[PDB]
Amino acid sequence: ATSTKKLHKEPATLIKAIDGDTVKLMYKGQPMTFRLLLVDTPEFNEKYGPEASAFRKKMVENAKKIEVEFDKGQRTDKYGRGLAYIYADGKMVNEALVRQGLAKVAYVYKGNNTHEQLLRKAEAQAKKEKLNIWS
Amino acid sequence: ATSTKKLHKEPATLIKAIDGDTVKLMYKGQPMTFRLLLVDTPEFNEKYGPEASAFRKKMVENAKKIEVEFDKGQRTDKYGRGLAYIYADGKMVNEALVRQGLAKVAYVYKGNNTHEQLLRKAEAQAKKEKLNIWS
Ligand SMILES: Cc1cn([C@H]2C[C@H](OP(=O)(O)O)[C@@H](COP(=O)(O)O)O2)c(=O)[nH]c1=O
Numbered sequence A, B: 001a002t003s004t005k006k007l008h009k010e011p012a013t014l015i016k017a018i019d020g021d022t023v024k025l026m027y028k029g030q031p032m033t034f035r036l037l038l039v040d041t042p043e044f045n046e047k048y049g050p051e052a053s054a055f056r057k058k059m060v061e062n063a064k065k066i067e068v069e070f071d072k073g074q075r076t077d078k079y080g081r082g083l084a085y086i087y088a089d090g091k092m093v094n095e096a097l098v099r100q101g102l103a104k105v106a107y108v109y110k111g112n113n114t115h116e117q118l119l120r121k122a123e124a125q126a127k128k129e130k131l132n133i134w135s
């Protein structure tokens, strides 16, 4: 159609999927974006990115109980994301992503590194097993 | 497990699923939430809710080409949602929901009702076939 007297169709596309280490939840009555402490997944458009997103999604959305755990240091990054460890039925999403070789340990800063050694242990095991990013 | 001097876990929940007649898209370079003109699906937690949402998601997310089409009146509602007809490979999502008895024709206001007669014809057939909402 071209008539200026009628309606006009315009293109649209799908919004890009969220990366695996960004976790959006309902917290204290408000939607909130968390960035997982101590980890770095590939972005969705790079190799293992879709796998990291799908793994986080599966863990979080299948959970009976989700919890949020801030560390001792800064609570929010400069982008206004909550900096947390996130748990699904008692299993830490941050640790699981690293154990699966879907994220590397990263962003290890003073005061916000309580679970550092637990995560490095997961990474060493993922690497020993040549999983995903380590393959 | 008990020390109050270390970290604390807090509860969080999933953000509730979007209803079938809300659609989020990338449009002219930005994310935008649309509300489908002329239709009303059940909410996700009511009967046929999940079906309406799955039907829309399948239609939109499998499309080769998605289009949006504003009417002549109000472009956004009071919630900031774009009021549009949405097309998936040339088939209108608004019309299709109604045709399958997953939405009723509603919110029909003079000036934003270009496709009224189309949608009411779809509803009559859905009702005739006793489909879904009409069963
Ligand atoms: C995980 C984490 C990220 N960030 C910041 C560092 C990067 O911002 P800058 O690029 O401006 O330096 C960004 C990486 O997160 P993403 O991997 O989500 O993009 O988030 C922190 O500041 N603290 C943290 O604990």
Ligand SMILES: Cc1cn([C@H]2C[C@H](OP(=O)(O)O)[C@@H](COP(=O)(O)O)O2)c(=O)[nH]c1=O
Pocket (backbone or CB within 6 Å): B022, B035, B036, B037, B038, B039, B040, B077, B078, B083, B107, B112
């Ligand atoms: C479809 C549509 C809805 N709306 C408003 C009417 C309802 O708001 P109010 O109840 O506050 O009056 C609401 C229904 O949308 P939902 O079915 O998504 O909830 O959106 C419009 O204003 N114009 C429209 O064309």
